[PDB]
From Swiss-Prot, chain A:
Impact reported for K290A: No effect on heptamerization
Region Interaction with host N-linked glycan, residue ranges: 45-61
Name of protein: Aerolysin
Region annotation Interaction with glycans from host GPI-anchor: where it falls in the sequence: 323-332
Record keyword DNA repair present: no
Major subcellular site: secreted
Compartment(s) where it occurs, according to its Swiss-Prot or TrEMBL record: Secreted; Host cell membrane
Length: 450, 451
């Protein structure tokens, strides 16, 4: 309600202080109210407008809010959807075997069993608890189900209530883990150093009576990169990454490691590869003069414990019968029908399985084709639903660890010194054999117009 | 390369961009999906080239065919070769004197890059008499709390005024601890345990069901915590904005770190915060409902680590060369020259290399150094790889041990209604007992939802 929702802001390019159909300019106070969020949605040196001649700058300008004018405007809806589900801080589960990472999440009474149970209960699912308790989400048994788990109330002994024997089950299945490359952190560097294995030197001469410029002196060469990694546990066998990425750089050791996408993290533990590389400068040597040029070749290796975060997602399927005269299905059946509905807890898939969608579009009558979330609100009130939904939708991440080590060869910049006279050709010796013995193959120096 | 910071959303109709801009295509959109989605509303839908669309974070940034009257665009003629943001240059924590010494003497990560910056900008003799190259045979001397990197001047040299070595002064250091870089070791202690269950009843002595009253639980909790600081640098680190101590395990901690205070002067204590749980139950006519409130105790400890970003001022003193320098006026009188940069978060245009470089193509902006001249003198590549080194983020590890104990209540739970043999409450609370277990000023109240 009252509070401004960052994720509902929309930008317009309609001129100063102008908004599109059914949007109004965001004012200073509101902007300040969620400063971090607006800035995080802006470009480096972006500058957008706010109400009554004010402006908010991007991260580059330190997201500052001051008087000003902008052609574009941060606008808010004249009819904003109220009572958003908050997004709680991530629940970080330490690295372990898939089974253990999953037990830790699934049997957590306060962060999983109770919220998901209460969600099912709020949706009108009957008997969401075991007969050892009168409260929902208690005396809940967690049992293995393939690569998933099932959560149903213990059914030992007898129970009171019509069909109390038919306990609703909460199926947690279809798990997935997406390693986030940006979450990269590393411990103390075990090994680290970069030797100067050789330095190529010589000169670059200018013969003509006119200043030689606009030519690129380019060094091309090959070297091998040897890296390897370990995986402390087995969850590794199931994590992938949306897209390929370059292993992050640490120290002064230039590496060229490409982790491949959608390929088991546990299946990519290292490799030896020779990579063609290059370096180049565009000198400007004055008439009939020469410049000293130097290229330092290096060798570096580094080792360290590493850690990434994998975003966990799973399917939440609720199955049981819908309570009589207390139901949230849109048709509000009264025949206590056996029911099955699955929510995708993680990356969006479709409307039917998106709690956040059905919640946010709850006031658009034509969109409610599944759970009538409005019912949960008259039944429980805004705060209770918001707090509960936030708990079931809380992001879950799993740590991914192990040791990393690598060694590679590479050249530094082609450096040049103060030009010397005399009274664009190169005189830079390249000992093929010594270089080859050092691990630098197919090394060449070329001159080519800019 | 599609540079995300040059992207621009326009609201001018189907596939329409602003002047000198063009529609982002499906592929280009995929190459920078996260940056685009990170600028979009939860359920925003925006257009791309040839009738495609990219959706907001809520739809998981799906890229698919669709019609949209607002569009993601890119310059037809983009400012090319933006300075690459390299990975962080980690520095071994220690006492302030250590981190500075380690930074300042780093030949390949600081001396060479800052010396080349001066040289490319036209500063003369940025090198020692014992080398023909820029940035070699340099001497670093103190000058208060600031440092000075300048070519060795001993012996004899050649060149007009070769005795005038350009000095690179580093001063005014500052270290900003980044709360999001949080990480921890083995959580050498943990768990939660139930220490008491406060139970009672809500009764309804009416012939009609009751749903108009909030039962709320209010109380004070004290978190007894602490944290050590392995090294001395922490005496100078601060945080721009306050933050909640990060949640680890399942011990709810109510700890806050204040901005503008030395990291080292916030090592723990007993902090009291007032919490409040509530619920609006529905009690059938002539009925009562059991109310349950569990109270927990929790202990946690573990080594911790946050990184502190290091910023400093880089001042270049020397005279600008004869045949060309970078100053927008391009003097030739071979003048002494003082100019300082701010290596770290923005401050102002004059002292921001990133700013002058990114806006180089805008004539009115070049009021200091024009980096278009340096690019025509050394090539586009040379210059962005050099500025990539100069602006390479530098950070020191801030480590130590963290320990904490706290008491917290679970949510208020409601049982099944059972026929009695404004909503009313009957739940005993013994101030002294509760207090013995770390819960003070505990109250259960029944309030109409209409207040």
């Amino acid at each position: 309600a009252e509070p401004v929702y960052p994720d509902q802001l929309r930008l317009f390019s309609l001129g100063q202080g102008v908004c599109g159909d059914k949007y109004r300019p965001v004012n200073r106070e509101e902007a300040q109210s969620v400063k971090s969020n607006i800035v995080g949605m802006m470009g480096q040196w972006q500058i957008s407008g706010l109400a009554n001649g004010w402006v908010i700058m991007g991260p580059g300008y330190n997201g500052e809010i001051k008087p000003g004018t902008a052609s574009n405007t941060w606008c808010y809806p004249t009819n904003p959807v109220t009572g958003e589900i908050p997004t709680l801080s991530a629940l970080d589960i330490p690295d372990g075997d898939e089974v253990d990472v999953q037990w830790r999440l699934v049997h957590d009474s306060a962060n999983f069993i109770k919220p998901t149970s209460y969600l099912a209960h709020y949706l009108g699912y009957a008997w969401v608890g075991g007969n050892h308790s009168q409260y929902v989400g208690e005396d809940m048994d967690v049992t293995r189900d393939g690569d998933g788990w099932v959560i149903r109330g213990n059914n030992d002994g007898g129970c009171d209530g019509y069909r109390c024997g038919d306990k609703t089950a909460i199926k947690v299945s279809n798990f997935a883990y997406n390693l986030d490359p940006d979450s990269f952190k590393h411990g103390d560097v075990t090994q680290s150093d970069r030797q100067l294995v050789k330095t190529v030197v010589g000169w670059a001469v200018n013969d003509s009576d006119t200043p030689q410029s606009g030519y690129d002196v380019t060094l091309r060469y090959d070297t091998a990169t040897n890296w390897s990694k370990t995986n402390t546990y087995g969850l590794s066998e199931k994590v992938t990454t949306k897209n390929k990425f370059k292993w992050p750089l640490v120290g002064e050791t230039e590496l060229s490691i490409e982790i491949a996408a959608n390929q088991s993290w546990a299946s990519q533990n290292g490799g030896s590869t020779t990579t063609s590389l290059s370096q180049s400068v565009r000198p400007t040597v004055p008439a009939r003069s020469k410049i000293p040029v130097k290229i330092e070749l290096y060798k570096a290796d580094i080792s360290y414990p590493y850690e990434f975060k994998a975003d966990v997602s799973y399917d939440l399927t609720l199955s049981g019968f819908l309570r009589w005269g207390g139901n949230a299905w849109y048709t509000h059946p009264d025949n206590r029908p056996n029911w099955n509905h699955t929510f995708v807890i993680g990356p969006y898939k479709d409307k039917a399985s998106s709690i956040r969608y059905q919640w946010d579009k709850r006031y658009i009558p034509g969109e409610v084709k599944w759970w009538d979330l409005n019912w949960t609100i008259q039944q429980n009130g805004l705060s209770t639903m918001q707090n509960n939904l936030a708990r079931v939708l809380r992001p879950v991440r799993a740590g991914i660890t192990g040791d990393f080590s690598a060694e590679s060869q590479f050249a530094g910049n082609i450096e040049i010194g103060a030009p010397v006279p005399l009274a664009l050709r190169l005189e830079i010796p390249l000992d093929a054999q010594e270089l080859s013995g050092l691990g630098f193959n197919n090394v060449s120096l070329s001159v080519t117009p800019a």
